[PDB]
Amino acid sequence: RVFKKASPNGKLTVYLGKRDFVDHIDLVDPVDGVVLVDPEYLKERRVYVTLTCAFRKDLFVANVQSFPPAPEDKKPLTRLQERLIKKLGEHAYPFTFEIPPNLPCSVTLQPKACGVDYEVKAFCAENLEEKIHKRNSVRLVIRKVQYAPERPGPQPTAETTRQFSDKPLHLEASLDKEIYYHGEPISVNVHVTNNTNKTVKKIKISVRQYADICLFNTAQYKCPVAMEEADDTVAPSSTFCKVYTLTPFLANNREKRGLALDGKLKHEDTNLASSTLLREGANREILGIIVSYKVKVKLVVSAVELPFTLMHPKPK
Amino acid sequence: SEELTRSTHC
């Protein structure tokens, strides 16, 4: 079931077989579609598709033209693209792209929604030089999207002995898995060993969303999106365990501008921004936004963390 | 100012 948008002149149309495209981690799905024109009244003799990542500053930009068919531009039709053309007839001409990896998913900033945008612009012109007329173009928005590694990432865990008291104060953070599903109850199964001569008033259970961005330089910021503070004292020379529970939800941050969401198509309010996955083992220079979570648990004196990736499950 | 992104199924 394919989306359609027609220009203000009404003769021009673009098709996309879907507006959210998956990343396999190794390669990111390329776009496919069809651009429609009236050849019988089209003396311009040309058409363009431009696929652009747009941070509300463009990033990766590419120009393709299904019409007039350039034999040097032939890529074999996708089954959906041919299923479209065979339904449209001789006046319709396919296109397909190659989105390079290193390009983020569509994730956005909490208030057109700022953040990256994939903006399929189909327009008509005799050559690229002339400005695009408003009556002569269409503008489909879409998303690159990212999903859980299906193999369960083996148990993450952290620890730290923090001396003041020759006896140690020590804690462990153990959680079911690094890859989490949005809305799933987080089971914070922490433990602390306090042999020391000092007490603790509160243990602070929370989640924070880091936000990597590379636009002017490499830049970073973070926002708490889950929280529970317990007055649970652990006395000197005493040990403690308690399975705390948390989940992140946007409602209690609606006022916290800048928190990341997954891409708003037009003006949606879909779930918080999913944490993305880097390519390769190296710190490759992926564009745009990288966001990730860490569970922060701290004993207030009288700090333990663990990375996790709360991101949507691979849709069935 | 008044386009529409409204579906078709081949």
Partner: antibody
Amino acid sequence: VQLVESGLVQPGGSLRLSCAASGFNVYSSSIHWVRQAPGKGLEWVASISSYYGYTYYADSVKGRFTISADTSKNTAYLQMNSLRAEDTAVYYCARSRWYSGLDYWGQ
Amino acid sequence: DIQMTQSPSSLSGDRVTITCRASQSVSSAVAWYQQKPGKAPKLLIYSASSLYSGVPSRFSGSRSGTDFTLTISSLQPEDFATYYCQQYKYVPVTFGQGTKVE
């Protein structure tokens, strides 16, 4: 991993329906209630999209019903009040979730 | 609000095909359900095609325009149940009047 709702009154009165799940949490989903008069179809009355925190109500209950979610015990409640004669039905709580249909149900 | 209606009200291994239609453009955002006497309903199909887990394969969602359809490839002896078709793009949601079968 299962749902139940629990909790006769004179017209103009009220009841609480207590909606209880198990094996899974509330925030994963929006909570709904749905009417069913004997021998007739159902109708969406009220629902709390717990993750969003927003809630919506239907015409046939508008403003007079109210709903809230107790996250602390995986449960939500219907603030039904001032019931009028046609509000007699077998009530259900419901939990969903993208709304791949309304997926979990009580008894 | 969108009214959605179905036919026939009642009818008695034979293949089952049934259809309902919506008063306004709602896309494929239709659900289907079934329910035996006195129980809460069980979800069959979402986005008018996608068979939910565990549901017997004979249940299958179909679409044409704003007319949506369900097919049970056969009427198993366990297939006497209520059924609703329901749109979920707009609030208030609207279940139809549904089918009893025997």
